[model samples]
Target: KGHWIPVVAGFLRKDGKILVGQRPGQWEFPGGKIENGETPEEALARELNEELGIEAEVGELKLACTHSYGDVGILILFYEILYWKGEPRAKHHMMLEWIHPEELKHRNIPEANRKILHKIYKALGLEW
Candidate 1:
């Protein structure tokens, strides 16, 4: 296996839409690499706040998997966050938007994130 980087993403939901951000040319969920001495949930909360300036109440673990982009492997843990405080504002990405599941397929998200996005949709019973 290639080297792994632990990462965390928030499936932040509100008004039947999920929050997403664009970094470079790819659309991604609000998240980042897990830091040393930090739990996955802790890192998720920190990433959400840092990237979007929102405080998320991290909920149940939704999905965990390892994905590869060429030679780089990433171990990602996705958490369901049905509740959070403050409106999301892009602090890290080029832009941020709330998108419904039906609209997700239209976005230029990375391959690693596509499965997780589908999982989020299925978990919430939002038809793909």
Candidate 2:
């Protein structure tokens, strides 16, 4: 937890559904550490494209929560994306699913991400 882990995460969305990408070996957002000189927005856009083959215009980042789980100190910065492009491809995961906000609870989501799912529903004006 000593490192100032710079990263970005996007809640890529469309009409009534949002994009959910799976990690190749873990279940988490399609994101990673920000590279040298990479801004959060830049890192987010690149990660989305590189991992999911999806593109999005990053909007205002919503500072969700920060908590530590043993050795990993998590600093989450969620975002609401209004402009999205490209089709998602399953290059590293089993598959990608665009599900409605209400449907997120039914999936086998990572426990740490439950709050994020709740945030998405709230952002979309759908009471969870």
Candidate 3:
């Protein structure tokens, strides 16, 4: 059997830009896997803090999907980062960028997480 992981992410938005982080070559919404007994929301807030150094007030469930990467599969839940304290900085990622949603299509990101782009664009009142 292949490894299946449950993950959570935040669509950290501000000033018409979304928070995306990079590790080596991939740019992704800053987040991490859901630990044992943790709710998706709980994991999202913790990961935002741990990965982006922000205390995020995780909001509504924006979107979710699953993807298989040959051997490993992941179930990813994305949420809106309604409010937060502290400036976002790269803590886990090698670098961070605040970019428009349209540009996300151009970035090297995970397939599962990319599913949120449509919802993100609609929420932000932008065309996909």
Top of the candidates by lDDT: 1
Ranked candidates, highest lDDT first: 1, 3, 2
By the lDDT metric, which is better: model 1 or model 3? Answer: 1
Residue 77 shift from truth in candidate 3, angstroms: 0.3
TM-score of each: 0.89, 0.81, 0.87
Q: Pairs clashing in candidate 1?
A: none
Over 12-121, each residue of candidate 3 has an lDDT whose tens digit, in order, gives 88987888889857888888899998888889888888887788898988767778888988887878886999999887888999997878888988766566667667
Error of 3 at 35 (Å): 0.5
Which digits, one per residue and each the tens of the lDDT, describe model 2 over residues 12-41?
Answer: 768788777766544455666678987878
Model 3, stretches more than 4 Å misplaced?
Answer: 1-3, 114-116, 119-125
TM-score between candidate 2 and the true structure: 0.81
**Models ranked on TM-score:** 1, 3, 2
Candidate 1 ranges beyond 4 A from true positions: 115-117
Which ten residues in a row are the worst by lDDT in model 1? 115-124
RMSD of each: 1.7, 2.3, 2.1
Selected candidate, larger TM-score, 1 vs 3: 1
Compared with the true structure, the alpha-carbon lDDT of candidate 3 equals: 0.82
